[PDB]
Enzyme design. Structure first.
Site, PDB file in Angstrom:
ATOM      1  N   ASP A 201      12.121 -47.115  -9.631  1.00 39.97           N
ATOM      2  CA  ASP A 201      13.696 -47.403 -11.044  1.00 39.97           C
ATOM      3  C   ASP A 201      13.314 -46.450 -12.137  1.00 39.97           C
ATOM      4  O   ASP A 201      14.084 -46.095 -12.362  1.00 39.97           O
ATOM      5  CB  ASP A 201      13.299 -48.864 -11.913  1.00 39.97           C
TER       6      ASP A 201
ATOM      7  N   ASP B 140      14.389 -43.930 -16.398  1.00 42.37           N
ATOM      8  CA  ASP B 140      14.674 -44.937 -16.144  1.00 42.37           C
ATOM      9  C   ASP B 140      15.683 -45.817 -16.325  1.00 42.37           C
ATOM     10  O   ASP B 140      16.575 -46.037 -17.244  1.00 42.37           O
ATOM     11  CB  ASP B 140      13.212 -45.725 -17.394  1.00 42.37           C
TER      12      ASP B 140
HETATM   13  N1  LIG Z   1       7.377 -58.673  -8.395  1.00 40.47           N
HETATM   14  C1  LIG Z   1       6.896 -57.803  -9.265  1.00 40.47           C
HETATM   15  N2  LIG Z   1       7.891 -56.103  -9.594  1.00 40.47           N
HETATM   16  C2  LIG Z   1       7.537 -55.294 -10.498  1.00 40.47           C
HETATM   17  C3  LIG Z   1       5.818 -55.530 -11.363  1.00 40.47           C
HETATM   18  N3  LIG Z   1       5.708 -54.106 -10.879  1.00 40.47           N
HETATM   19  C4  LIG Z   1       6.923 -53.431 -10.955  1.00 40.47           C
HETATM   20  N4  LIG Z   1       7.918 -54.238 -10.452  1.00 40.47           N
HETATM   21  C5  LIG Z   1       9.583 -53.862 -10.588  1.00 40.47           C
HETATM   22  C6  LIG Z   1       9.884 -54.765 -11.058  1.00 40.47           C
HETATM   23  C7  LIG Z   1      10.608 -53.153 -12.301  1.00 40.47           C
HETATM   24  C8  LIG Z   1      10.522 -52.258 -11.379  1.00 40.47           C
HETATM   25  C9  LIG Z   1      10.107 -51.295 -12.682  1.00 40.47           C
HETATM   26  O1  LIG Z   1       9.171 -52.324 -13.320  1.00 40.47           O
HETATM   27  P1  LIG Z   1       7.986 -51.767 -14.597  1.00 40.47           P
HETATM   28  O2  LIG Z   1       6.718 -51.556 -14.359  1.00 40.47           O
HETATM   29  O3  LIG Z   1       8.864 -50.570 -14.749  1.00 40.47           O
HETATM   30  O4  LIG Z   1       8.975 -52.556 -15.562  1.00 40.47           O
HETATM   31  P2  LIG Z   1       9.977 -52.167 -16.208  1.00 40.47           P
HETATM   32  O5  LIG Z   1      10.901 -53.920 -16.011  1.00 40.47           O
HETATM   33  O6  LIG Z   1      10.567 -51.116 -15.587  1.00 40.47           O
HETATM   34  O7  LIG Z   1      10.308 -52.148 -17.822  1.00 40.47           O
HETATM   35  P3  LIG Z   1       9.629 -50.807 -18.118  1.00 40.47           P
HETATM   36  O8  LIG Z   1      10.054 -50.197 -16.718  1.00 40.47           O
HETATM   37  O9  LIG Z   1       9.686 -50.836 -19.286  1.00 40.47           O
HETATM   38  O10 LIG Z   1       7.967 -51.509 -17.773  1.00 40.47           O
HETATM   39  O11 LIG Z   1       9.241 -52.018 -10.278  1.00 40.47           O
HETATM   40  C10 LIG Z   1       4.893 -56.572 -10.012  1.00 40.47           C
HETATM   41  O12 LIG Z   1       4.054 -56.841 -10.906  1.00 40.47           O
HETATM   42  N5  LIG Z   1       5.917 -57.455  -9.226  1.00 40.47           N
HETATM   43 MG   LIG Z   2      12.029 -49.391 -15.277  1.00 40.53          MG
END
Ligand SMILES: Nc1nc2c(ncn2[C@H]2CC[C@@H](COP(=O)(O)OP(=O)(O)OP(=O)(O)O)O2)c(=O)[nH]1
Ligand SMILES: [Mg+2]
Length: 625
Positions: free
Chosen positions: A575, A379
């Site tokens: 990601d 990740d």
């Molecule tokens: N605009 C938007 N982008 C999102 C959303 N969910 C995920 N993303 C994008 C932003 C980062 C990428 C991975 O999101 P994650 O859910 O992994 O959040 P993260 O930042 O990776 O934190 P983690 O992975 O620890 O949850 O996908 C959302 O609801 N809206």
């Molecule tokens: Mg992530």
DNA sequence: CGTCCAATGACAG
DNA sequence: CTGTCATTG
């Protein structure tokens, strides 16, 4: 009228054939089919390096050689060493699927896929086809193709409409057209600086996607069925928990049936409508708004998830486990990547459930590695944020991001109520949705909607986050003006997406395009980092370990006439990078993944990579230095 | 008149 | 042959 060539006459015809063939750099290939659909039945390959003429490779009709020709083909199709040439096919991953699985030939050389380039020009373009490309690129040769009337996949895949034209014919015409056309495309890509971006970046991504797509991913019907029955338990139990208040001849599936108790015994409607409003009641009201939440969620979790998985599962006898095979896609506007036979990207997230005596279920947990193996997940920690932090060069975001701890937990902590932690997941997820929304310029009222607050208040919060970070707004308005001055934006690699609507008069189209420039740049560049990380990882893994490439190459071993070791490409969560690896190499594989992901390209901050590891789809994460 | 982004699918006429 | 809603990222 006609130019084609069957290559068989005793020896010398075929001999001067391979004699010319071995010498050439750029060349084109296409195959064709008949019936019986995996399938081992392939009429024959065809090759063309240019001109009206086309060469065919069979499997009139003379004879000397049998297996010999196949050896010659193999020898021709790979890179002895130091010798570097390129090869083109309409689509790629499935033709390679055929060569490897059906005929057991692992094609390894430099690759060029014309439809991918077509996409590289116009990410918004819809799914190019042979007629489309020969129409748009190689005009003077086109009319011949209209004798067939098939354009979706290659000419093998177009076997039905081509069936009256079927044979060497489809493969040859596809070959030659693809060649001249791809010379035109490569010309246009070099007419920009996309060629470096094309051949040295995204084609390798198509490749890595292909060997993934041959790998598949492992699955467990016992777990799937266990949690299936669990969901049934909550299904009926919530049925009776629901109709404990009243019930009148109810079934949830019909919204008009819901209208009875919904419009009668509560009476708060701010056909009528369904979702957003009942989430709005999900926040405050206890008496069964959220019963519809858990029920509808279970329903999507079964009918659209359990079923197609448990259906199109196959087995790999080579393993003794059953696995499922997605499909490489690309063709996103940003450059991100998806998969469809099913799409397992969207597979549901683990969530808690009530019968202390609670419980919890993971639909995704049903995914397993091979018996000796373990799952490695890599990740990126808030990556898109790091890219935007890089381009805006706002030092503040940099310093906030180089410190705090899952800052979403901190946002939730100060928001819906103050709790230091014990933030539930769908809360963190809603907050994530919200925040990432704010950054790209979510409208004040919709923000007020997901947060549950009043408009002008939310707007004051948005203005507040502008006030916090000025590099963001700088880069934002700047890039808007630039997309007006240009008419397109550009991802870091130099790939560029063309936005027509930014210059448009209509305010909604102009607004959507406004946010669209932002997200296309940041997400697009993200997907580019991810791609480079992938192709790098697999490229090291390739030569670094000598065993073999992927599970499909086993089927190649049977069709060519054992231990299990390596680590293999499975999936991408955009990601996240998803691997299964024998539990031997897990540490080596881990450092390699970490390294290549961080070594993708260097920038204003380091990209921290959390590497989770363990059995199945749920996991623990630690590594020490 | 429609103002988070990008994906994938069932559903309806 | 279109726009919604469900989930993920
Ligand atoms: N605009 C938007 N982008 C999102 C959303 N969910 C995920 N993303 C994008 C932003 C980062 C990428 C991975 O999101 P994650 O859910 O992994 O959040 P993260 O930042 O990776 O934190 P983690 O992975 O620890 O949850 O996908 C959302 O609801 N809206
Ligand atoms: Mg992530």
């Amino acid at each position: 009228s006609l130019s084609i060539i069957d290559v068989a006459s005793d020896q010398n015809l075929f001999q001067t054939f391979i004699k010319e063939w071995r010498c050439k750099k750029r060349f084109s290939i296409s195959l064709a089919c008949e019936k019986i659909r995996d399938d081992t039945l392939v009429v024959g390959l065809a090759v063309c390096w240019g001109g009206r003429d086309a060469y065919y490779f069979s499997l009139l009709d003379p004879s000397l050689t049998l297996k010999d020709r196949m050896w010659y083909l193999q020898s021709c199709l790979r890179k002895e060493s130091d010798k570097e040439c390129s090869v083109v096919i309409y689509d790629f991953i499935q033709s390679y699927k055929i060569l490897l699985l059906s005929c057991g030939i692992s094609l390894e050389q430099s690759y060029e896929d014309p439809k991918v380039a077509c996409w590289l020009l116009d990410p918004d373009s819809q799914e190019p086809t042979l007629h489309s490309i020969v129409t748009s690129f190689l005009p003077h040769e086109l009319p011949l193709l209209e004798g067939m009337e098939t354009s979706q996949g290659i000419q093998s895949l177009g076997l039905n409409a081509g069936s009256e034209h079927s044979g060497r014919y489809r493969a040859s015409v596809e070959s030659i057209l693809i060649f001249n056309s791809m010379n035109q495309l490569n010309s246009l890509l070099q007419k920009e600086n996309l060629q470096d971006v094309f051949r040295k970046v995204e084609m390798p991504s198509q490749y890595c996607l292909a060997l993934l797509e041959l790998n598949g991913i492992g699955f467990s019907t016992a777990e799937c069925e266990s949690q299936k029955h669990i969901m049934q338990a909550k299904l009926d139990a919530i049925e009776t928990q629901a109709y404990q208040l009243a019930g009148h001849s109810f079934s949830f599936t019909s919204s008009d049936d819901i209208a009875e108790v919904l419009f009668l015994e509560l009476k708060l409607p701010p056909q009528f409508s369904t979702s957003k409003d009942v989430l709005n009641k999900l926040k405050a009201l206890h008496p069964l708004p959220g019963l519809i939440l858990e029920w509808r969620r279970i329903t999507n979790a079964i009918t659209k998830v359990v079923f197609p998985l448990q259906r199109e599962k196959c087995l790999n006898p080579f393993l003794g486990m059953e696995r499922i095979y997605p499909v490489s896609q690309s063709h996103t506007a940003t450059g991100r990547i998806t998969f469809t036979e099913p799409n397992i990207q969207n597979v549901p997230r683990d969530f808690e459930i009530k019968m202390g005596m609670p419980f919890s279920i993971s639909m995704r947990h049903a995914f397993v590695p091979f018996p000796g193996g373990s799952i490695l997940a890599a990740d990126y920690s808030q990556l898109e944020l790091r890219i935007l932090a890089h381009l805006s060069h706002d030092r503040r975001l940099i310093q906030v991001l180089n410190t705090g701890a899952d800052v979403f937990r901190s946002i939730a902590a100060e928001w819906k109520m103050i709790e230091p932690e014990s933030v539930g997941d769908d809360l963190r997820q809603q907050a994530k949705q919200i925040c990432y929304g704010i950054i790209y310029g979510m409208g004040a009222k919709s923000l007020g909607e997901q947060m549950g607050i009043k408009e002008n208040d939310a707007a004051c919060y948005i203005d507040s986050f502008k006030s916090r970070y000025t590099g963001i707004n700088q880069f934002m308005t700047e890039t808007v003006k630039n997309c007006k001055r240009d008419g397109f934006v550009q991802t870091i690699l130099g790939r560029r997406r063309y936005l027509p609507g930014i210059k448009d008069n209509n305010p909604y189209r102009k607004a959507h395009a406004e946010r669209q420039a932002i997200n296309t740049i940041v997400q697009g560049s993200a997907a580019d980092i991810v791609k480079i990380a992938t192709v790098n990882i697999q490229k090291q893994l390739e030569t670094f370990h000598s065993t073999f490439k992927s599970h499909g190459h086993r089927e190649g071993m049977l069709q060519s006439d054992c231990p299990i070791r390596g680590g293999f490409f499975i999936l991408q969560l955009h990601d996240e990078l998803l691997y299964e690896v024998a539990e031997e190499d897990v540490v080596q594989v881990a450092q390699i993944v970490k390294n290549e992901m961080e070594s993708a390209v260097k920038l204003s901050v380091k990209l921290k990579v959390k590497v989770k590891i363990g059995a199945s789809w749920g996991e623990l994460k630690d590594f020490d230095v």
